[PDB]
Amino acid sequence: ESADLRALAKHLYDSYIKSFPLTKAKARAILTGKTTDKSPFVIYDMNSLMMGEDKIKFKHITPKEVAIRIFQGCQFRSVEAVQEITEYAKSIPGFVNLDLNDQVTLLKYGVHEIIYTMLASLMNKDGVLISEGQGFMTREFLKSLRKPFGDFMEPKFEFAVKFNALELDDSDLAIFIAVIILSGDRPGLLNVKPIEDIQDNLLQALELQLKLNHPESSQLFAKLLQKMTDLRQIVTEHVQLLQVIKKTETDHPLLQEIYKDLY
Amino acid sequence: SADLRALAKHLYDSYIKSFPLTKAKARAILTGKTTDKSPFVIYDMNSLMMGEDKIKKEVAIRIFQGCQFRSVEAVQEITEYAKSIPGFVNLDLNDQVTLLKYGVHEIIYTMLASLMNKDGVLISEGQGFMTREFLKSLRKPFGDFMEPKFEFAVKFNALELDDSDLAIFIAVIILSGDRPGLLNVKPIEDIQDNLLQALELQLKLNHPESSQLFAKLLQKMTDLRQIVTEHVQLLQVIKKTETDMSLHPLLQEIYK
Numbered sequence: 001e002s003a004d005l006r007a008l009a010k011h012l013y014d015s016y017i018k019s020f021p022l023t024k025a026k027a028r029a030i031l032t033g034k035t036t037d038k039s040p041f042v043i044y045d046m047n048s049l050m051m052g053e054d055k056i057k058f059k060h061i062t063p064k065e066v067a068i069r070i071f072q073g074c075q076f077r078s079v080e081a082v083q084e085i086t087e088y089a090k091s092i093p094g095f096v097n098l099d100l101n102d103q104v105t106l107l108k109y110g111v112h113e114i115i116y117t118m119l120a121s122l123m124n125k126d127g128v129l130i131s132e133g134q135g136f137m138t139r140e141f142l143k144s145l146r147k148p149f150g151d152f153m154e155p156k157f158e159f160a161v162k163f164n165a166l167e168l169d170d171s172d173l174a175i176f177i178a179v180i181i182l183s184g185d186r187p188g189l190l191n192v193k194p195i196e197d198i199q200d201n202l203l204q205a206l207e208l209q210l211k212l213n214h215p216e217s218s219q220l221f222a223k224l225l226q227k228m229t230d231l232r233q234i235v236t237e238h239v240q241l242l243q244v245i246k247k248t249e250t251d252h253p254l255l256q257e258i259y260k261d262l263y
Numbered sequence: 264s265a266d267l268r269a270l271a272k273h274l275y276d277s278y279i280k281s282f283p284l285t286k287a288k289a290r291a292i293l294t295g296k297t298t299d300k301s302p303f304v305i306y307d308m309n310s311l312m313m314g315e316d317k318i319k320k321e322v323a324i325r326i327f328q329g330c331q332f333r334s335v336e337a338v339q340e341i342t343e344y345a346k347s348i349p350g351f352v353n354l355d356l357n358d359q360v361t362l363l364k365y366g367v368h369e370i371i372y373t374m375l376a377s378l379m380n381k382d383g384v385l386i387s388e389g390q391g392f393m394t395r396e397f398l399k400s401l402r403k404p405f406g407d408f409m410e411p412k413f414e415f416a417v418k419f420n421a422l423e424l425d426d427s428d429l430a431i432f433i434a435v436i437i438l439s440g441d442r443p444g445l446l447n448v449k450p451i452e453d454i455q456d457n458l459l460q461a462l463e464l465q466l467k468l469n470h471p472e473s474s475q476l477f478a479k480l481l482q483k484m485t486d487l488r489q490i491v492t493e494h495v496q497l498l499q500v501i502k503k504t505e506t507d508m509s510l511h512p513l514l515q516e517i518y519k
């Protein structure tokens with residue numbers, strides 16, 4: 001069965017690769033200057049953004065204020081992320097054989113956590129990759145947006161730095177992501193047995209992958225599990241904010257229906 | 264590996280030495296394993312009337328008031344326990360203070376599960392039982408205050424941890440790298456990294472049936488935090504309203 005856990009691990013990595021265009025390896029390149037291919041357009045102050053939008057050209061333009069056009073771009077891209085993560089989750093052994101109600105429940109509450117995890121791979125302490133890699137937006141500029149949106153992006157940076165210090169690679173993350181999805185304590189799951197049975201195989205595969213790939217750091221597995229509560233914390237804070245954008249900010253119907261804050 | 268069993272034993276020893284009401288003892292009282300231990304139930308107002316003569320300001324207030332003064336005696340207790348943990352005394356004194364004052368809520372609720380079942384919680388050092396319903400039949404603000412504790416407890420007690428596990432887990436909680444205000448997090452993580460090494464082995468030997476117990480326990484921190492937040496949120500609504508939530512010298516210095 002040691003031989004199985006190694007293949008569950010290789011299985012998830014391929015799908016992870018097929019499911020997610022912008023991998024951590026590919027991000028970490030763009031960030032360091034590791035390739036001689038392209039380089040990110042940078043967004044450091046109010047000036048830089050102006051010029052950015054022309055050369056960079058985004059998908060989420062909606063012909064508002066700057067800080068709103070960012071938030072919503074974040075949300076557009078997260079709706080994109082959901083479909084990628086929805087594809088990935090189908091590849092996890094057993095998952096599709098689950099009750100459809102549970103499938104939906106698991107994704108519904110899983111996706112925020114998986115987005116913040118993957119966002120860590122696009123960040124360093126100084127900013128974050130945007131627009132499928134082609135841009136870079138500084139942490140300072142994000143911290144300088146107006147009263148509500150100044151703190152928006154900051155908890156994720158705090159987490160990212162802590163998280164990225166574990167130095168995980170995509171193969172480790174592909175298994176970590178499967179674990180978050182198959183979290184058998186989502187509200188309203190109908191049949192928790194097969195969910196935990198699968199989570200149990202995934203943890204065993206994760207545990208083993210971490211040992212072989214990161215032998216130098218003992219209790220990396222435990223360190224990683226602790227970060228699920230960090231992830232979970234960032235989500236309650238994000239729901240805290242979404243409530244005070246509903247209550248204070250003013251917004252098309254079909255745009256707020258595409259970007260339906262699930263809960 | 265055998266040097267980790269040694270550490271587990273040390274912690275379990277100082278755990279028993281530091282806390283008078285073990286899980287073990289509480290389970291006996293709640294099951295009636297020999298009946299000189301049988302607790303007095305409080306489930307209504309005449310029961311509470313009778314129970315002040317029986318056991319060791321408005322009524323719902325005076326519950327919360329005693330419910331808080333029991334927690335300061337719990338901090339006294341947790342501080343002793345921390346001091347027994349290899350390394351903790353060697354840290355920057357300021358970190359000691361910090362490390363505790365954040366961890367004390369999280370450990371309280373962990374140990375309070377040991378006092379709890381579906382229907383109620385033990386009070387007055389084991390001597391009493393107070394009903395989940397009678398707790399949540401207090402007229403607000405206080406009618407919501409114990410109910411999230413019961414929710415965590417039932418799902419936490421699910422794991423069936425015995426005291427020799429709770430001791431190590433509670434060590435893990437105290438020594439959190441992620442606390443705000445820590446000068447040297449590095450040494451803090453060096454200890455926790457071993458504690459975790461110890462908790463893992465412990466849980467395979469004591470619970471060999473349970474395959475991902477290690478993982479499933481560590482995951483409970485999320486609930487354990489969620490409940491801690493709700494406590495102060497609530498404790499600040501009472502703050503400006505209630506006359507007069509008066510405080511001990513160890514109450515006030517935790518958040519103000």
Ligand SMILES: Cc1c(C)n(Cc2ccc(Cl)c(OCC(=O)O)c2)c2ccc(C(=O)NCc3ccc(C(C)(C)C)cc3)cc12
Binds near residue numbers: 071078128132137
């Ligand atoms: C996936 C993702 C990325 C790549 N970023 C980085 C980012 C930062 C800044 C900008 Cl202007 C940005 O522009 C969009 C783009 O370049 O594609 C992207 C996120 C910044 C924030 C978030 C985020 O907080 N998502 C929360 C969220 C929002 C909505 C959902 C739904 C309702 C779709 C399920 C989930 C999670 C997600 C992302």
Ligand SMILES: Cc1c(C)n(Cc2ccc(Cl)c(OCC(=O)O)c2)c2ccc(C(=O)NCc3ccc(C(C)(C)C)cc3)cc12
Binds near residue numbers: 331371378386494513
């Ligand atoms: C330790 C503890 C017990 C044994 N109970 C159950 C309980 C319920 C009802 C009553 Cl009347 C009660 O009486 C006290 C007693 O039994 O002697 C005990 C808690 C019920 C609630 C809480 C609780 O929510 N404590 C939170 C808290 C409050 C203050 C702190 C400080 C600020 C001192 C650090 C931490 C945590 C703790 C306990």
